[PDB]
Enzyme design. Structure first.
Site, PDB file in Angstrom:
ATOM      1  N   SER A 172     144.005 116.752  66.454  1.00 48.28           N
ATOM      2  CA  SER A 172     142.739 116.915  66.451  1.00 48.28           C
ATOM      3  C   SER A 172     141.904 116.678  67.567  1.00 48.28           C
ATOM      4  O   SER A 172     142.284 116.621  68.504  1.00 48.28           O
ATOM      5  CB  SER A 172     142.071 116.869  64.959  1.00 48.28           C
ATOM      6  OG  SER A 172     141.292 117.847  64.590  1.00 48.28           O
ATOM      7  N   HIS A 199     145.314 121.746  58.427  1.00 50.86           N
ATOM      8  CA  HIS A 199     144.934 120.772  59.428  1.00 50.86           C
ATOM      9  C   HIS A 199     145.252 119.452  58.938  1.00 50.86           C
ATOM     10  O   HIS A 199     144.715 118.934  57.660  1.00 50.86           O
ATOM     11  CB  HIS A 199     143.652 121.084  59.685  1.00 50.86           C
ATOM     12  CG  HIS A 199     143.073 120.303  61.002  1.00 50.86           C
ATOM     13  ND1 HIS A 199     143.510 120.558  62.090  1.00 50.86           N
ATOM     14  CD2 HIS A 199     142.214 119.223  61.082  1.00 50.86           C
ATOM     15  CE1 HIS A 199     142.766 119.705  63.142  1.00 50.86           C
ATOM     16  NE2 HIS A 199     142.172 119.044  62.429  1.00 50.86           N
ATOM     17  N   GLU A 232     145.399 126.062  60.003  1.00 49.50           N
ATOM     18  CA  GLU A 232     144.462 125.102  60.347  1.00 49.50           C
ATOM     19  C   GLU A 232     142.873 125.346  59.787  1.00 49.50           C
ATOM     20  O   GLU A 232     142.420 124.293  59.833  1.00 49.50           O
ATOM     21  CB  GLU A 232     144.333 125.453  62.010  1.00 49.50           C
ATOM     22  CG  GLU A 232     145.606 125.004  62.658  1.00 49.50           C
ATOM     23  CD  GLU A 232     145.848 123.411  62.756  1.00 49.50           C
ATOM     24  OE1 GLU A 232     146.544 123.051  63.647  1.00 49.50           O
ATOM     25  OE2 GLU A 232     145.224 122.627  62.284  1.00 49.50           O
ATOM     26  N   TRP A 256     141.648 110.209  54.134  1.00 50.71           N
ATOM     27  CA  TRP A 256     141.162 110.245  55.855  1.00 50.71           C
ATOM     28  C   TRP A 256     140.025 109.421  55.957  1.00 50.71           C
ATOM     29  O   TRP A 256     139.615 108.905  57.298  1.00 50.71           O
ATOM     30  CB  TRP A 256     140.837 111.648  56.000  1.00 50.71           C
ATOM     31  CG  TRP A 256     141.753 112.524  56.167  1.00 50.71           C
ATOM     32  CD1 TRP A 256     141.865 113.702  55.138  1.00 50.71           C
ATOM     33  CD2 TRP A 256     142.888 112.883  56.985  1.00 50.71           C
ATOM     34  NE1 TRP A 256     143.141 114.289  55.185  1.00 50.71           N
ATOM     35  CE2 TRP A 256     143.756 113.696  56.307  1.00 50.71           C
ATOM     36  CE3 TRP A 256     143.630 112.016  57.861  1.00 50.71           C
ATOM     37  CZ2 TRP A 256     145.048 114.278  56.555  1.00 50.71           C
ATOM     38  CZ3 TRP A 256     144.794 112.469  58.164  1.00 50.71           C
ATOM     39  CH2 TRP A 256     145.383 113.616  57.792  1.00 50.71           C
TER      40      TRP A 256
HETATM   41  O1  LIG Z   1     137.790 119.782  64.622  1.00 51.77           O
HETATM   42  S1  LIG Z   1     136.699 119.583  64.226  1.00 51.77           S
HETATM   43  O2  LIG Z   1     135.651 119.335  65.267  1.00 51.77           O
HETATM   44  C1  LIG Z   1     135.937 121.092  63.536  1.00 51.77           C
HETATM   45  C2  LIG Z   1     136.638 122.238  63.404  1.00 51.77           C
HETATM   46  C3  LIG Z   1     136.076 123.468  62.746  1.00 51.77           C
HETATM   47  C4  LIG Z   1     134.965 123.335  62.371  1.00 51.77           C
HETATM   48  C5  LIG Z   1     133.832 122.470  62.657  1.00 51.77           C
HETATM   49  C6  LIG Z   1     134.362 121.052  63.185  1.00 51.77           C
HETATM   50  N1  LIG Z   1     136.534 118.378  63.155  1.00 51.77           N
HETATM   51  C7  LIG Z   1     137.886 118.043  62.416  1.00 51.77           C
HETATM   52  C8  LIG Z   1     137.443 117.074  61.378  1.00 51.77           C
HETATM   53  C9  LIG Z   1     136.225 116.672  61.732  1.00 51.77           C
HETATM   54  C10 LIG Z   1     135.491 115.545  60.843  1.00 51.77           C
HETATM   55  O3  LIG Z   1     135.992 114.648  59.827  1.00 51.77           O
HETATM   56  C11 LIG Z   1     136.960 115.188  59.220  1.00 51.77           C
HETATM   57  C12 LIG Z   1     136.840 114.647  57.867  1.00 51.77           C
HETATM   58  N2  LIG Z   1     137.735 114.970  56.745  1.00 51.77           N
HETATM   59  C13 LIG Z   1     139.238 115.199  57.257  1.00 51.77           C
HETATM   60  C14 LIG Z   1     139.941 116.107  56.823  1.00 51.77           C
HETATM   61  C15 LIG Z   1     141.179 116.863  57.180  1.00 51.77           C
HETATM   62  C16 LIG Z   1     141.950 117.732  56.663  1.00 51.77           C
HETATM   63  C17 LIG Z   1     141.574 118.166  55.287  1.00 51.77           C
HETATM   64  C18 LIG Z   1     140.423 117.626  54.595  1.00 51.77           C
HETATM   65  C19 LIG Z   1     139.757 116.652  55.374  1.00 51.77           C
HETATM   66  C20 LIG Z   1     134.178 115.529  61.535  1.00 51.77           C
HETATM   67  C21 LIG Z   1     133.513 116.359  62.252  1.00 51.77           C
HETATM   68  C22 LIG Z   1     134.320 117.228  62.850  1.00 51.77           C
HETATM   69  C23 LIG Z   1     135.659 117.527  62.570  1.00 51.77           C
END
Ligand SMILES: O=S(=O)(c1ccccc1)n1ccc2c(OCCNCc3ccccc3)cccc21
Ligand SMILES: *[C@@H]1O[C@H](CO[C@@H]2O[C@@H](C)[C@@H](O)[C@@H](O)[C@@H]2O)[C@@H](O[C@@H]2O[C@H](CO)[C@@H](O)[C@H](O)[C@H]2NC(C)=O)[C@H](O)[C@H]1NC(C)=O
Ligand SMILES: *[C@@H]1O[C@H](CO[C@@H]2O[C@@H](C)[C@@H](O)[C@@H](O)[C@@H]2O)[C@@H](O[C@@H]2O[C@H](CO)[C@@H](O)[C@H](O)[C@H]2NC(C)=O)[C@H](O)[C@H]1NC(C)=O
Ligand SMILES: *[C@@H]1O[C@H](CO[C@@H]2O[C@@H](C)[C@@H](O)[C@@H](O)[C@@H]2O)[C@@H](O)[C@H](O)[C@H]1NC(C)=O
Ligand SMILES: CC(=O)N[C@H]1[C@H]([C@H](O)[C@H](O)CO)O[C@@](O)(C(=O)O)C[C@@H]1O
Ligand SMILES: *[C@@H]1O[C@H](CO)[C@@H](O)[C@H](O)[C@H]1NC(C)=O
Ligand SMILES: *[C@@H]1O[C@H](CO)[C@@H](O)[C@H](O)[C@H]1NC(C)=O
Ligand SMILES: *[C@@H]1O[C@H](CO)[C@@H](O)[C@H](O)[C@H]1NC(C)=O
Length: 526
Positions: free
Chosen positions: A195, A435, A322, A79
């Protein structure tokens, strides 16, 4: 192959895909680079160029903090950006079938990443397979993220908020003005994203300035009514003000704050983004969409409730697990490297981490609703409850509520529940169908037999690719040729949805009924 656009000629490159050819134009500029005095402003239109622009490599990704929590581990690093970071990042990509199509439907991808991260050049967003297999045109853009994309002092055009959404919108405009020269149909444009990209798509459904720029919409694991997707104007001001304090840019003239922030190196801004929230959650949306009075004319819950949105078909869905990905970014007792059997005490501390600033009573009510077990001796009870808590609250229940409210105004909606865990997934088995891990199936990566997926996954991806393409082309996500389960419309009464898996595709009803009544009807009161 050279194509004449409104602002100049671009040259692409030929790709071999499945014994055929795709033409890729990677890194076409669609706006003035938002540098210097243009940082934090809405994107400005591009002036012509006289030579041929070589669109033969992915462009710079926008400035962003990187996930460093698991160095060397593919599950997280897949990612992270795979091109240089730069403020000079307003570029898009175009994949077209070869030979050039005559009036092809267009798929426009909007990546997610919490509005803080992301890039269109990731391997799992490669549009060459969709162009090859379904003869659609695929477009994807980079848009600004973090403070550089979403810093807000509402009404101040030096930093009005929602700049990253206006980046996306300007790219949609570019497609309207230019895609017929590539063989595309500007009257048949489907947005799709995941997302925060799906939240973005849902906000284009609400924004009057996007209404003429696309036809239909696909929302994978996100929607604006998710609790992380829209920043309140009070949060946004406190966060802008905190960023200024952290960078030495506090002033009484709010405009002079912005000019001071425009003299900081991007890295100073990125470093201080994490701290603008005092007590935030794993991967907090530090700078996200706001009600700016421009892109967003009102609180989006009001617009959704009162039917103020583009009337068209939607395809919406979520993944079975998710919430699990977020648990290893801060919940105590969790680890991708063991089976994360946690205690009741650890579950309670996990709620503190994911629900800061929620009352003690509110957190008890989550525990009450999620811990009335079938068998209380099962060691995995609390581990699985915390993942479901996080996934239902942040993704599944908001997506279902969005789909219900949207369909109540008369349009066809189709809802899916993706429950296949990829055979290559590098994260552990307890994390399930996480997710982000439907994306590679949507883009047809399992269609490449070299790439270690199973035969069943090739068939599943092939069916999903056909359903998505039929939705974009015809508004109806059916697979009509192979005796497939027919996908029924989602209605607020029966609430039918389609499950996507390698074994048996099934029509079910009222996904997470009991859980979403808690999150949607009770928990907003606490
Ligand atoms: O939907 S969220 O807002 C969110 C959902 C629930 C609690 C808090 C925030 N949210 C989603 C991604 C994200 C971010 O970067 C992602 C970096 N890794 C990606 C990854 C995906 C799947 C597996 C492992 C890694 C930064 C900030 C908020 C983010
Ligand atoms: C709004 O902002 C204030 C200020 O935040 C502090 O300063 C920033 C530059 C950044 O470094 C933050 O991490 C800091 O916390 C918040 O006020 C703080 O609140 C916490 C607990 O609520 C307290 O321990 C600190 O002492 C407070 N600091 C100050 C200067 O008052 C405030 O909580 C933020 N949020 C809201 C909703 O007001
Ligand atoms: C699963 O692992 C977590 C996290 O521990 C990580 O993995 C190990 C290799 C070890 O080196 C840890 O330091 C790593 O962070 C375990 O949670 C830890 O448990 C210990 C003792 O119970 C505690 O002191 C730490 O604070 C915990 N770390 C947290 C809460 O982040 C957990 O016990 C392991 N569970 C199982 C079932 O093996
Ligand atoms: C743009 O590209 C022109 C053509 O380059 C030819 O094809 C590409 C794919 C390369 O393989 C290159 O070696 C070939 O000569 C160049 O002639 C031109 O200089 C380029 N323009 C700029 C500004 O670099
Ligand atoms: C900011 C940035 O990434 N700039 C540029 C990179 C690097 O400066 C060099 O490769 C040295 O690392 O080089 C280019 O000239 C190129 O690859 O054609 C253009 C590209 O935009
Ligand atoms: C493409 O299709 C639209 C209708 O969807 C039509 O109005 C337009 O003229 C077509 N353009 C072609 C075939 O070049
Ligand atoms: C200071 O604020 C005023 C309005 O309050 C604005 O007109 C002026 O441009 C600001 N200062 C500078 C240097 O821009
Ligand atoms: C339909 O089935 C055939 C094999 O019978 C398969 O090769 C083809 O890819 C399938 N089409 C879709 C759209 O799944």
């Amino acid at each position: 192959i050279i194509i004449a656009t409104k602002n100049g000629k671009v040259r692409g490159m030929q790709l071999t895909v499945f014994g055929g050819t795709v033409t890729a134009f990677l890194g076409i500029p669609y706006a003035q680079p938002p540098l210097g005095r243009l940082r934090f402003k809405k994107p400005q239109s591009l002036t012509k160029w006289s030579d041929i622009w070589n669109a033969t490599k992915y462009a710079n990704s926008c400035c962003q903090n990187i996930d460093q929590s698991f160095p060397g581990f593919h599950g997280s690093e897949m990612w992270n950006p795979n091109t240089d970071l730069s403020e000079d990042c307003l570029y898009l990509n175009v994949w077209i079938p070869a030979p050039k199509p005559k009036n092809a439907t267009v798929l426009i991808w909007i990546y997610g990443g919490g509005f803080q991260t992301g890039t269109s050049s990731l391997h799992v967003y490669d549009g060459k397979f969709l162009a090859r297999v379904e003869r659609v045109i695929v477009v994807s853009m980079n848009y600004r993220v973090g403070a550089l994309g979403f810093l807000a002092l509402p009404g101040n055009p030096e930093a009005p908020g929602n700049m990253g959404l206006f980046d996306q919108q300007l790219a949609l405009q570019w497609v309207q003005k230019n895609i017929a020269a590539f063989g595309g149909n500007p009257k048949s444009v489907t947005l799709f994203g995941e997302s925060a990209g799906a939240a973005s798509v849902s906000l284009h459904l609400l924004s009057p300035g996007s209404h003429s720029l696309f036809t239909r919409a696909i929302l994978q694991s996100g929607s604006f009514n998710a609790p992380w997707a829209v920043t309140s104007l009070y949060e946004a001001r406190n966060r802008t003000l905190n960023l200024a304090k952290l960078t030495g840019c506090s002033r009484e003239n709010e405009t002079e704050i912005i000019k001071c922030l425009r003299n900081k190196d991007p890295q100073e801004i990125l470093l201080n983004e994490a701290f603008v929230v005092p007590y935030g959650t794993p991967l907090s949306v530090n700078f996200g969409p706001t009600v700016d009075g421009d892109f967003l004319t009102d609180m989006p819950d009001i617009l959704l409730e009162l039917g103020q949105f583009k009337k068209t078909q939607i395809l919406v869905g979520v993944n079975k697990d998710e919430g699990t990905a977020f648990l290893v970014y801060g919940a105590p007792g969790f680890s991708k490297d063991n089976n994360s059997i946690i205690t009741r005490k650890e579950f309670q501390e996990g709620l503190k981490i994911f629900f800061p600033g929620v009352s003690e009573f509110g957190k008890e009510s989550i525990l009450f609703h999620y811990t009335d077990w079938v068998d209380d001796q099962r060691p995995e009870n609390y581990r699985e409850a915390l993942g479901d808590v996080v996934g239902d609250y942040n993704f599944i229940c908001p997506a279902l509520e969005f789909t219900k409210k949207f369909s109540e105004w008369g349009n066809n909606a189709f809802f899916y529940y993706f429950e296949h865990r990829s055979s290559k997934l590098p994260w552990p088995e307890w994390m399930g169908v996480m997710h982000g891990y439907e994306i590679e199936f949507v883009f047809g990566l399992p269609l490449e037999r070299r790439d270690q997926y199973t035969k069943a996954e090739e068939i599943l991806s092939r069916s999903i690719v056909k359903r998505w393409a039929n939705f974009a082309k015809y508004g109806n996500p059916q697979e009509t040729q192979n005796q497939s389960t027919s996908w029924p419309v989602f209605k607020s009464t029966e609430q039918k949805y389609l499950t996507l898996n390698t074994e048996s595709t099934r029509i079910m009803t009222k996904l997470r009924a009991q859980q979403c009544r808690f999150w949607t009807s009770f928990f907003p009161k606490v």
